[PDB]
């Protein structure tokens, strides 16, 4: 599959618009992304904002500015001519049912499949909660793609200036287990379709991990053997330094 | 596209059901009767005027009685050579998928010849043949061992529309969440 | 007359798809937009006219406020003439559209052409008229053949926003007598006292 | 239709058709023009044996010589002749056990190969966990309606 | 089980290496040198 | 004298990206924010001006394009006027040219509080952005001779040559300043997203090394044997310690897979 990369310039741009647009009472701020989707790795080097207002009790009322789309063409094209509109982004933690109708408005300006980017403004997740989706023909479905961080001279300089293993993964595995656990509890309470089909894929593919235990410990002892021959070398860098430090002490006594 | 518009009357719905009743019975692709109970197909027609054999097909395929298929399909239908070959293909797939969930406990999906032969009333020569054909179509993965008299079958079919394992797999997620949380607390201490 | 923003709404429903006008009114409604556009454009050198089609296509935003008719005419040919006219969600999204103007001192005005009775309830129009009255939103309702086969469902919307003609709440009805297209809005207080007609 | 039967070949009905229906077999017009009934069937029987051995090698882990001879419709000498030839060509690797009168079609794997395939499953399980994780929000429209 | 004790024996002398080597260097810092 | 100039975290990332247009081609763009008296310059948002072939001159500024963009920024939540503009001088130090003096003087009648910022993205690759600002004089704290710009502290003049020679003598178009950044609590975790999405990549690298576990340790042991002979024939330890460090990272992490 393809890849999606979001620069920290786009990250901080979407996260700052929360307090800039006075977004509260669980609302969203619809932006726009600028990148090159022609390659296999989608990289967004520019982003902007758009005014968005939606009623809480009415999902059929939403405001969008299509005039600002033509305003960035008179600006960005005079600086970077390789910037095009590959889609938009949202500041909400989870998508709603209105995103299906938003794709009809941007399909004329975008020259390719629009990209759906979701950025969590609450920062309540672990790692990179920012996710991306690609709308294709199912009627329509959203194909998720992994999100990475852009590494370039135009970003890491500003990141290092403002700012300056398994234990982290343990908290990440709990998020995947509790997500499926709470989904079953909410399902049984509201009743007594794609999740039920893919749910048993994990159960039939951790009692099954105990059959290879005989072959698992075969390569585990090699790790300790590699550490045993390395442990002897560890003393070679120590005792040798003790001999050198002893010769330094003999010169300090004569002083 | 027939339900929203374009002659939504029951006149075209009863005529369309004649095509699905013949195709779903002979079709070996997705289950046998599984797709009939999900989509409201039989609910749009009546129970009389040669529509009765479609409703009785559910109990005939579920029980597995061979004598029911003789009286269910007369000579005006079974005379086609297609159903003559598919006459034995209906009871082989359902009884094969039934033995998978029956023997399954934790890690053991293994079957044998006596469980398959007594269920389908077929000789051991057809156990390594008719079942092998379903494996090659993508329904199953594991194979059958003729020497040691052991049948090792993997899990492929997602088994849609179950509902019994939903309450059983709920405790599986709790068991997985407790083992990770127990090992996760030891990582913070040391 | 003065500097103001006008939001136009085109009606596309089962009645517009059926026999309406010998010129295929859906194409003549495009000319009806040209009639009011040339009148408001010649009045002031700077004007903002929007286009929103909410009938049968679900609420959408076609083109924003612009002083040229080039992009307005091309977007109408790609729309759909089927569906039903919903003015409940069409008028609510037009209020937020009024904020798209540059100078907020401009007069807010909404001109909508209703050729068919709406199937939506009238309860949402009661609270909508009271909100538009506080912001002084000019309401222009053009009813074509709506009062014949059905009553007025927008009468309750006009009654709550009811104000003298110097501000808002202007209710009009197309004359059933045969006449020219641009003459229907000439006698009505729409293009009167403007640059052209 | 015979192409899709390469994987499902049971060898049972093949000699029945091979001895009855030969439309393109012993009669050639626009390509070979025909040669002889034995020449077209000389390499034909050798290939049909190869189609069955590929299925058994990809299905049966081990099978007795008594049953293998009944599935190949050959003798004991003709059975090991075509099997041993495919081993030298680098196609099918099968260990024939004479005392047990069986042929083991399971190829040996090292400890690193068994643990490598186990690593692909762990990365595959994370794909299903990630996929279902995003389906909760996608299916929230129907659940939250 | 035996391989686990070899790591314990290797790291046991590592901590004692810093104690034995660094201690005699404490007096050379306070004493005045040329 | 010195003062405190606050710059938002979002403004720094945009100025570094704008300066990437080209090294030989100088870039210029506007800024937004507020002020506290004369001693505080708040930089909140920045604007990107179009390029010009005149090399950032007084005639390279377009007020028509400026008025159209600033009116559109009001719908995006920007209530702040223009606090100045930044001009990149890559490859050199922080100094003002003869063109920048005539260009900045033209904006004195428009906004007397405008600030001309000199950013150097070439020398900023070291992890700390080298940047300097220059502000016009609205007086009101000065008139003839006074002492504005409270809280003189932190660094000194530095810069390069011309503007360093005169500080209090001519304060009009140039004088030294300092750079400060103010971040909130929510802006701290914004840059923390670099490190279960990343958990899959941890086991993904272990999958490739699972089949290569025999090949990886084969090159490590044979390398330690060759480095041992070099230490014996010396009668070194630096190259030997580097190999043991890579072996430690390939062992404990590989155990974490179980």
């Amino acid at each position: 599959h393809e890849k999606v990369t979001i620069a920290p310039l786009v990250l901080l741009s979407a996260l700052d618009h929360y307090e800039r647009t006075q977004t509260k009472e669980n609302k969203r701020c619809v932006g726009v992304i600028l990148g090159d989707a022609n390659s296999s790795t989608i990289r967004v080097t520019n982003s902007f904002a758009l005014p968005f207002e939606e009623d809480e009790k009415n999902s059929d009322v939403w405001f969008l500015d299509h005039n600002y789309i033509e305003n960035m063409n008179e600006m960005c094209k005079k600086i970077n001519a390789k910037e095009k509109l590959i889609g938009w982004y949202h500041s909400g933690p989870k998508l709603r049912a209105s995103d299906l109708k938003i794709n009809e408005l941007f399909k004329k300006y975008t020259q390719n499949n629009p990209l759906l980017l979701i950025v969590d403004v609450k920062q309540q997740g672990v790692g990179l909660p920012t996710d991306a989706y690609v709308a294709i023909e199912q009627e329509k479905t959203f194909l998720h793609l992994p999100c990475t961080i852009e590494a370039e001279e135009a970003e890491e300089i500003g990141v290092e200036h403002l700012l300056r293993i398994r234990l982290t993964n343990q908290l990440k595995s709990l998020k995947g287990l509790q997500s499926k656990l709470k989904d079953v509890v909410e399902y049984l309470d509201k009743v007594i379709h794609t999740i039920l089909g893919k749910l048993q894929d994990v159960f039939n593919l951790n009692n099954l991990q105990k059959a290879l235990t005989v072959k698992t410990n075969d390569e585990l002892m090699v790790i300790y053997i590699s550490n045993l021959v390395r442990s002897i070398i560890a003393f070679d860098d120590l005792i040798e330094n003790k001999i050198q430090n002893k010769k330094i002490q003999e010169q300090r006594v004569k002083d | 596209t027939l339900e929203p518009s374009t002659s939504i009357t029951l006149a075209e719905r009863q005529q369309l059901a004649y095509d699905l009743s013949i195709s779903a019975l002979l079709g070996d692709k997705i289950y046998n009767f599984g797709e009939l109970l999900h989509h409201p197909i039989m609910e749009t027609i009546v129970n009389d005027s040669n529509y009765d054999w479609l409703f009785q097909l559910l109990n005939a395929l579920t029980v597995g009685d061979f004598d029911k298929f003789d009286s269910l399909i007369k000579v005006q239908i079974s005379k086609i050579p297609i159903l003559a070959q598919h006459e034995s293909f209906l009871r082989q797939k359902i009884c094969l998928m039934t033995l998978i969930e029956t023997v399954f406990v934790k890690n053991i999906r293994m079957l044998s010849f006596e469980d398959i032969s007594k269920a389908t009333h077929l000789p051991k020569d057809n156990v390594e043949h008719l079942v092998m054909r379903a494996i090659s179509l993508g329904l199953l993965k594991g194979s059958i061992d003729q020497v040691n008299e052991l049948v090792t079958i993997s899990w492929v079919q997602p088994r849609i529309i179950s509902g019994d394992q939903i309450t059983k797999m709920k405790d599986r997620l709790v068991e997985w969440n407790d083992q990770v949380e127990k090992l996760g607390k030891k990582m913070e201490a040391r | 007359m003065v500097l103001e923003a006008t939001v136009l709404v085109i009606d596309n429903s089962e009645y517009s798809r059926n026999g309406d006008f010998p010129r295929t009114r859906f194409e003549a409604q495009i000319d009806s937009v040209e009639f009011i556009f040339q009148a408001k454009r010649n009045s002031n050198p700077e004007n903002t006219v929007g286009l929103i089609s909410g009938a049968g296509a679900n609420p959408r935003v076609l083109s924003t406020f612009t002083a040229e008719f080039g992009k307005i005419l091309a977007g109408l040919h790609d729309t759909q003439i089927e569906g039903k006219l919903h003015m409940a969600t069409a008028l609510q999204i037009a209020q937020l559209t009024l904020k798209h103007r540059q100078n907020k001192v401009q007069h807010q005005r909404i001109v909508a052409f209703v050729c068919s009775p709406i199937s939506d309830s009238r309860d949402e129009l009661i609270r909508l008229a009271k909100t538009l009255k506080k912001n002084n939103v000019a309401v222009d309702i053009i009813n074509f053949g709506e009062i014949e086969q059905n009553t007025e469902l927008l009468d309750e919307f006009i009654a709550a926003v009811n104000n003298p003609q110097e501000e808002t709440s202007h209710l009009l009805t197309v004359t059933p007598g045969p006449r020219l297209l641009y003459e229907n809005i000439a006698s009505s207080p729409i293009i009167l006292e403007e640059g052209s007609s | 239709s015979l192409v899709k039967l390469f994987t499902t070949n049971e060898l049972m009905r093949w000699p029945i058709v091979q001895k009855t229906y030969e439309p393109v077999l012993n009669e050639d017009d626009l390509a070979f023009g025909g040669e002889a009934n034995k020449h077209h069937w000389e390499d034909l029987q050798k290939r049909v044996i190869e189609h069955n051995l590929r299925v058994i090698s990809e299905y049966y882990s081990r099978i007795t010589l008594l049953r293998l001879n009944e599935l190949l419709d050959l003798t004991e000498s003709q059975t090991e002749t075509y099997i041993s030839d495919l081993v030298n060509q680098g196609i099918i690797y099968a260990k024939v056990n004479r005392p047990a009168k069986i042929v083991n079609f399971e190829k040996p794997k090292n400890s690193s190969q068994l643990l490598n395939e186990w690593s692909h499953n762990v990365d595959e399980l994370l794909e299903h966990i990630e996929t279902i994780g995003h389906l909760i929000t996608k299916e929230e429209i129907m659940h939250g309606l | 089980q035996v391989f686990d004790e070899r790591i314990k024996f290797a790291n046991q002398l590592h901590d004692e290496y810093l104690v034995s080597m660094r201690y005699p260097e404490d007096k050379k810092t306070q004493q005045n040198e040329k | 004298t010195k003062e405190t100039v606050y710059i938002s975290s979002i403004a720094l990332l945009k100025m570094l990206k704008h300066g990437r247009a080209g090294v030989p081609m100088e870039v210029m763009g506007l800024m937004l924010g507020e002020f506290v008296d004369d001693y505080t310059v708040n930089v909140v948002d920045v604007f990107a001006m179009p390029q010009s072939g005149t090399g950032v001159s007084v005639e390279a500024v377009d007020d028509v394009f400026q008025a159209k963009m600033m009116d559109m920024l009001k719908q995006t939540g920007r209530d702040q006027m223009v606090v100045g503009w930044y001009h990149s001088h890559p490859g050199f130090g922080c100094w003002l040219s003869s063109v920048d003096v005539n260009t900045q003087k033209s904006f004195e009648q428009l906004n007397s509080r405008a600030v001309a910022v000199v950013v150097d993205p070439i020398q900023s690759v070291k992890g700390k952005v080298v940047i300097d600002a220059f502000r016009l004089i609205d007086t009101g704290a000065l008139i003839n001779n006074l002492e504005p710009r409270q809280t003189t502290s932190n660094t000194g003049l530095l810069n390069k040559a011309n503007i360093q020679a005169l500080i209090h003598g001519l304060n009009r178009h140039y004088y030294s300043l300092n750079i400060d950044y103010h971040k909130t609590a929510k802006e701290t975790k914004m840059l923390m997203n670099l490190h279960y999405e990343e958990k899959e990549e941890s086991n993904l690298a272990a999958t490739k090394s699972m089949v290569k576990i025999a090949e990886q340790y084969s090159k490590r042991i044979e390398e330690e044997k060759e480095l041992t002979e070099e230490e014996l024939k010396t009668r070194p330890k630096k190259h030997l310690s580097e190999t043991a460090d890579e072996t430690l990272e390939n062992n404990i992490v590989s155990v974490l897979t179980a």
Side-chain angles (χ1 to χ4, degrees):
Chain A
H1 300 290
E2 294 178 351
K3 294 177 179 177
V4 176
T5 299
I6 303 301
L9 175 62
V10 176
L11 295 174
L12 275 67
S13 178
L15 296 174
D16 289 343
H17 297 165
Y18 176 78
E19 294 178 351
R20 294 181 180 276
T21 59
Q22 295 300 321
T23 299
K24 62 182 178 181
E25 294 177 351
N26 191 30
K27 292 176 179 177
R28 294 174 297 179
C29 183
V30 176
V32 63
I33 60 174
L34 277 68
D36 186 4
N38 290 336
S39 63
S40 64
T41 299
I42 294 171
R43 296 182 181 276
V44 176
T45 59
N46 190 341
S47 64
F48 297 99
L50 295 173
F52 178 80
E53 295 301 321
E54 183 179 2
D55 187 5
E56 294 178 350
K57 294 177 179 177
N58 189 340
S59 64
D60 291 344
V61 176
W62 61 91
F63 177 79
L64 178 63
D65 185 4
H66 294 82
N67 190 30
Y68 180 79
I69 296 170
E70 294 177 350
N71 287 283
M72 68 189 85
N73 291 337
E74 294 177 351
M75 176 179 71
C76 296
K77 293 177 179 177
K78 294 177 179 177
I79 296 170
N80 290 283
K82 294 176 179 177
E83 294 178 351
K84 63 182 178 181
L85 297 175
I86 59 173
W88 61 94
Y89 64 88
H90 300 291
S91 64
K94 294 177 179 177
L95 59 82
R96 300 290 182 269
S98 63
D99 290 344
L100 295 175
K101 295 177 179 178
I102 303 301
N103 191 30
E104 294 177 351
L105 296 175
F106 295 97
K107 63 182 178 181
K108 294 177 179 177
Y109 295 93
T110 59
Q111 294 177 336
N112 58 33
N113 189 340
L115 177 63
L116 177 63
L117 178 63
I118 302 301
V119 176
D120 186 5
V121 296
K122 294 177 179 177
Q123 294 300 321
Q124 295 300 321
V126 178
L128 179 63
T130 299
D131 291 343
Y133 295 93
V134 176
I136 60 172
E137 183 178 2
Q138 185 174 355
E139 294 177 350
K140 293 178 178 178
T141 187
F142 296 97
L143 178 63
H144 186 278
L145 295 175
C147 296
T148 59
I149 303 301
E150 182 67 14
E152 63 184 343
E153 69 282 3
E155 297 303 321
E156 293 178 350
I157 291 173
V159 176
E160 294 178 350
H161 183 198
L162 296 174
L163 295 175
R164 293 174 296 180
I165 295 170
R166 182 177 181 171
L167 177 62
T168 300
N169 291 337
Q170 293 300 321
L171 296 175
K172 294 177 179 177
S173 63
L174 296 175
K175 183 178 179 180
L177 296 175
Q178 293 177 336
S179 296
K180 294 177 179 178
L181 177 62
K182 294 176 179 177
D183 181 67
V184 176
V185 176
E186 294 177 350
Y187 176 78
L188 296 175
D189 291 344
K190 294 177 179 177
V191 175
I192 61 172
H193 300 291
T194 59
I195 294 172
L196 296 175
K198 302 299 183 181
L199 178 62
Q200 294 179 337
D201 291 344
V202 177
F203 297 96
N204 290 283
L205 295 175
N206 290 336
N207 290 336
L208 296 175
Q209 295 178 336
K210 294 177 179 177
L212 295 175
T213 300
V214 176
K215 302 299 183 181
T216 299
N217 291 283
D218 291 344
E219 296 301 321
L220 295 175
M221 294 182 287
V222 177
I223 296 169
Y224 295 93
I225 294 170
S226 178
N227 290 283
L228 177 62
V229 296
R230 181 178 63 84
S231 296
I232 296 170
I233 296 171
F235 295 99
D236 290 344
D237 291 344
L238 296 175
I239 296 171
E240 183 179 2
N241 290 336
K242 183 178 179 180
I243 296 170
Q244 185 64 59
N245 290 337
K246 183 178 179 180
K247 294 177 179 177
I248 296 170
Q249 295 177 336
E250 294 177 351
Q251 294 177 336
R252 294 182 182 175
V253 175
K254 294 176 179 177
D255 187 5
Chain B
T1 59
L2 178 63
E3 294 177 351
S5 178
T6 304
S7 295
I8 62 172
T9 59
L10 296 175
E12 295 301 321
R13 294 182 182 175
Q14 294 178 336
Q15 185 64 59
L16 189 147
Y18 176 78
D19 290 344
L20 295 175
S21 63
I22 303 301
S23 63
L25 177 62
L26 296 174
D28 59 353
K29 183 178 179 180
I30 296 170
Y31 295 93
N32 290 283
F33 59 90
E35 295 301 321
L36 296 175
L37 295 175
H38 182 62
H39 187 279
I41 295 170
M42 67 191 85
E43 294 177 350
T44 59
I45 61 172
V46 295
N47 62 345
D48 59 353
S49 295
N50 290 336
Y51 292 96
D52 181 67
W53 58 273
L54 178 63
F55 296 96
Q56 295 300 321
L57 179 63
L58 296 175
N59 290 336
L61 294 175
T62 299
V63 175
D65 186 5
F66 177 80
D67 291 344
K68 294 181 181 297
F69 296 97
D70 290 344
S71 63
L72 178 63
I73 303 301
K74 294 177 179 177
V75 296
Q76 294 177 336
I77 295 171
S78 63
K79 62 182 178 181
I80 184 169
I82 302 301
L83 178 61
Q85 294 178 336
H86 294 82
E87 183 178 2
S88 63
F89 295 162
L90 296 175
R91 298 179 66 250
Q92 64 180 21
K93 183 177 179 179
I94 295 170
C95 295
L96 178 62
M97 297 297 103
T98 300
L99 295 175
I100 302 301
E101 62 184 342
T102 299
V103 68
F104 177 80
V105 176
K106 303 298 183 180
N107 61 345
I108 295 170
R109 291 190 296 273
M110 177 178 71
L111 294 173
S112 64
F113 293 97
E114 294 178 351
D115 291 344
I116 295 170
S117 178
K118 293 176 179 177
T120 59
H121 295 82
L122 296 175
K124 294 177 179 177
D125 291 344
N126 290 336
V127 176
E128 62 185 343
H129 296 166
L130 296 174
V131 176
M132 177 178 71
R133 294 182 182 175
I135 296 170
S136 63
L137 295 175
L139 296 175
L140 296 175
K141 183 178 179 180
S143 64
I144 295 171
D145 185 4
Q146 185 64 59
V147 176
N148 290 283
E149 294 178 351
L150 296 175
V151 176
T152 299
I153 302 301
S154 178
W155 182 88
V156 175
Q157 185 66 57
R159 298 179 65 250
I160 188 169
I161 303 170
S162 63
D164 290 344
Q165 295 300 321
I166 295 171
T167 59
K168 294 177 179 177
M169 293 182 286
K170 183 178 179 180
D171 290 344
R172 300 289 182 269
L173 296 175
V174 176
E175 183 178 2
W176 294 357
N177 190 30
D178 290 344
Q179 293 177 336
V180 176
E181 183 178 2
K182 183 178 179 180
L183 296 175
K185 293 177 179 177
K186 294 176 179 177
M187 294 299 294
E188 294 177 351
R190 292 192 298 273
Chain C
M1 177 178 71
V2 296
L3 177 62
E4 63 184 343
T6 299
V7 176
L8 296 175
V9 176
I10 185 169
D11 186 5
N12 291 336
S13 64
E14 62 184 343
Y15 295 93
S16 296
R17 181 177 64 84
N18 291 336
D20 187 4
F21 186 81
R23 294 288 293 174
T24 303
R25 179 60 178 165
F26 176 78
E27 294 178 351
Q29 292 177 336
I30 296 171
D31 291 344
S32 296
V33 175
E34 295 177 351
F35 295 158
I36 186 169
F37 177 80
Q38 294 178 336
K40 301 299 183 181
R41 181 177 181 171
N42 290 337
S43 178
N44 291 283
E46 183 178 2
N47 190 340
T48 59
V49 176
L51 177 63
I52 294 170
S53 178
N58 290 337
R60 300 289 183 269
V61 176
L62 296 175
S63 178
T64 59
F65 296 96
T66 187
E68 294 178 351
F69 58 89
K71 294 176 179 177
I72 295 171
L73 298 176
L76 295 174
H77 300 291
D78 290 344
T79 59
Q80 295 300 321
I81 62 173
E82 62 184 343
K84 294 177 179 177
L85 174 63
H86 300 290
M87 294 300 294
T89 59
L91 295 175
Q92 293 177 336
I93 62 172
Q95 185 174 355
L96 296 174
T97 302
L98 296 174
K99 294 177 179 177
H100 187 278
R101 66 184 182 276
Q102 296 300 321
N103 290 337
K104 294 177 179 177
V105 297
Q106 294 178 336
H107 182 62
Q108 294 177 335
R109 181 177 181 171
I110 295 170
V111 176
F113 297 96
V114 175
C115 296
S116 63
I118 60 172
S119 63
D120 290 344
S121 63
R122 293 173 296 180
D123 290 344
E124 296 301 321
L125 296 174
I126 295 170
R127 293 173 296 180
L128 178 63
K130 294 176 179 177
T131 300
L132 296 175
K133 183 178 179 180
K134 294 177 179 177
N135 290 337
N136 191 30
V137 176
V139 176
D140 186 4
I141 302 301
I142 295 98
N143 291 337
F144 177 80
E146 184 179 2
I147 62 172
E148 296 301 321
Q149 63 180 19
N150 190 340
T151 59
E152 294 178 351
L153 275 67
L154 296 175
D155 181 67
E156 183 67 14
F157 177 80
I158 303 301
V161 70
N162 190 340
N163 288 282
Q165 294 178 336
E166 294 177 350
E167 294 177 350
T168 185
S169 178
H170 295 82
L171 178 63
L172 296 175
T173 300
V174 176
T175 299
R179 62 184 297 175
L180 295 176
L181 296 175
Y182 63 91
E183 293 178 350
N184 290 282
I185 60 173
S187 63
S188 296
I190 295 170
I191 61 172
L192 178 63
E193 294 178 351
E194 295 301 321
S196 64
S197 296
Chain D
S1 63
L2 297 174
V3 176
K4 294 177 179 177
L5 295 175
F6 294 161
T7 301
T8 61
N9 187 339
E10 295 177 351
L11 192 144
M12 293 177 70
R13 294 182 182 175
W14 291 91
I16 295 170
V17 176
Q18 186 174 355
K19 293 176 180 177
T20 300
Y21 295 94
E22 302 88 358
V24 296
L25 277 65
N26 63 346
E27 183 178 2
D28 290 344
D29 290 343
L30 296 175
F32 292 161
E35 294 177 351
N37 291 337
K38 183 178 179 180
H39 297 166
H40 297 166
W41 294 356
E42 183 178 2
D43 290 344
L44 177 63
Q45 186 174 355
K46 294 177 179 177
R47 299 290 182 268
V48 176
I49 296 170
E50 294 177 350
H51 298 293
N52 192 341
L53 296 175
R54 182 177 181 171
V55 176
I56 295 172
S57 64
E58 294 177 350
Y59 178 79
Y60 296 96
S61 296
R62 61 180 65 86
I63 185 169
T64 59
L65 294 175
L66 296 175
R67 180 59 179 165
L68 178 62
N69 290 337
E70 293 177 350
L71 295 175
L72 296 175
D73 289 344
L74 295 175
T75 59
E76 294 178 351
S77 296
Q78 295 300 321
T79 299
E80 294 178 351
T81 299
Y82 295 92
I83 295 171
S84 63
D85 290 344
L86 296 175
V87 176
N88 191 30
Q89 294 300 321
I91 295 170
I92 294 170
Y93 295 93
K95 294 177 179 177
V96 176
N97 190 340
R98 186 175 178 84
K101 294 177 179 177
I102 62 172
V103 176
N104 191 30
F105 296 93
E106 182 178 2
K107 291 189 295 184
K109 294 177 179 177
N110 291 336
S111 64
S112 64
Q113 294 178 336
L114 296 175
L115 295 175
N116 190 30
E117 294 178 350
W118 182 87
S119 296
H120 299 291
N121 290 337
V122 175
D123 291 344
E124 183 178 2
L125 295 175
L126 296 175
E127 294 177 351
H128 299 291
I129 294 171
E130 183 179 2
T131 299
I132 295 171
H134 300 293
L135 294 175
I136 295 171
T137 300
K138 292 166 62 181
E139 294 179 351
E140 184 67 14
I141 296 170
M142 295 300 294
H143 297 165
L145 178 63
Chain E
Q1 185 64 59
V2 177
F3 295 160
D4 290 344
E5 294 177 350
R6 295 183 180 276
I7 295 171
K8 295 176 179 177
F9 295 159
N11 290 336
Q12 183 65 259
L13 296 175
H14 296 165
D15 291 344
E16 294 178 351
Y17 176 78
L18 178 63
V19 176
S20 63
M21 177 179 72
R22 178 63 181 87
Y23 176 76
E25 294 178 351
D26 291 344
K27 294 177 179 177
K28 270 68 180 180
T29 59
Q30 294 178 336
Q31 293 178 336
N32 190 30
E33 294 177 350
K34 294 176 179 177
Chain F
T1 58
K2 301 292 184 291
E3 65 184 344
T4 300
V5 175
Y6 295 93
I7 295 171
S8 64
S9 63
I10 186 169
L12 177 62
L13 295 175
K14 293 177 179 177
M15 293 183 286
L16 296 175
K17 179 62 174 172
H18 185 198
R20 184 56 182 163
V23 177
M25 183 65 73
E26 294 177 350
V27 297
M28 177 178 71
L30 296 174
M31 295 183 287
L32 296 174
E34 62 184 343
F35 296 98
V36 176
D37 290 344
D38 290 344
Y39 64 90
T40 298
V41 175
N42 189 340
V43 176
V44 176
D45 187 4
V46 296
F47 177 79
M49 293 178 71
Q51 295 300 321
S52 178
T54 59
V56 182
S57 64
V58 63
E59 294 178 350
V61 176
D62 186 4
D63 290 344
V64 176
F65 178 80
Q66 184 175 355
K68 294 177 179 177
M69 294 301 294
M70 296 297 179
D71 290 344
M72 294 300 294
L73 295 175
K74 294 177 179 177
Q75 295 300 321
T76 60
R78 300 290 182 269
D79 58 353
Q80 296 301 321
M81 295 300 294
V82 176
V83 296
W85 61 93
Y86 62 91
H87 182 197
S88 178
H89 297 165
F92 296 96
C94 296
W95 57 276
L96 295 175
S97 63
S98 63
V99 177
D100 290 344
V101 175
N102 291 336
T103 300
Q104 187 174 356
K105 183 178 179 180
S106 63
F107 295 96
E108 183 178 2
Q109 294 178 336
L110 296 175
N111 290 283
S112 61
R113 293 178 179 84
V115 177
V117 175
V118 175
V119 63
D120 187 4
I122 302 301
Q123 294 299 320
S124 296
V125 296
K126 62 182 178 181
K128 293 184 175 74
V129 175
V130 176
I131 185 169
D132 187 4
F134 296 96
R135 183 183 65 195
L136 294 175
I137 297 171
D138 58 352
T139 61
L142 177 63
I143 305 171
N144 189 340
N145 189 340
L146 291 175
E147 294 178 351
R149 292 191 297 273
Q150 294 177 335
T151 304
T152 61
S153 63
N154 291 337
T155 59
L157 298 176
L158 183 63
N159 297 129
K160 180 61 174 172
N162 290 336
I163 63 102
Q164 186 176 356
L166 296 175
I167 302 301
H168 299 290
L170 179 63
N171 60 345
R172 293 182 182 175
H173 294 82
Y174 61 90
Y175 60 92
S176 179
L177 291 174
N178 291 336
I179 303 301
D180 186 5
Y181 296 92
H182 186 278
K183 291 189 295 184
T184 59
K186 294 177 179 177
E187 294 178 351
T188 299
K189 294 177 179 177
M190 295 179 182
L191 295 174
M192 293 178 70
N193 297 131
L194 177 63
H195 300 290
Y196 62 90
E197 184 178 3
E198 294 178 351
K199 183 174 178 290
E200 183 178 2
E201 294 178 350
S202 296
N203 291 337
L204 177 63
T207 299
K208 294 177 179 177
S209 64
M210 183 65 73
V211 63
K212 294 176 179 177
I213 186 169
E215 294 178 351
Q216 294 300 321
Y217 295 141
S218 178
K219 294 177 179 177
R220 299 289 182 268
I221 295 171
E222 293 177 350
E223 183 178 2
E224 293 176 350
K225 180 180 76 179
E226 294 177 351
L227 295 175
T228 300
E229 294 177 350
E230 294 178 351
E231 183 178 2
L232 178 63
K233 293 176 179 177
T234 300
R235 298 296 300 277
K237 63 182 178 181
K238 294 177 179 177
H239 300 290
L240 178 63
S241 63
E242 294 177 351
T243 300
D245 291 344
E246 294 177 351
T247 301
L248 176 62
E249 294 178 351
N250 291 337
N251 289 336
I252 303 301
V253 176
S254 63
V255 176
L256 297 175
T257 60

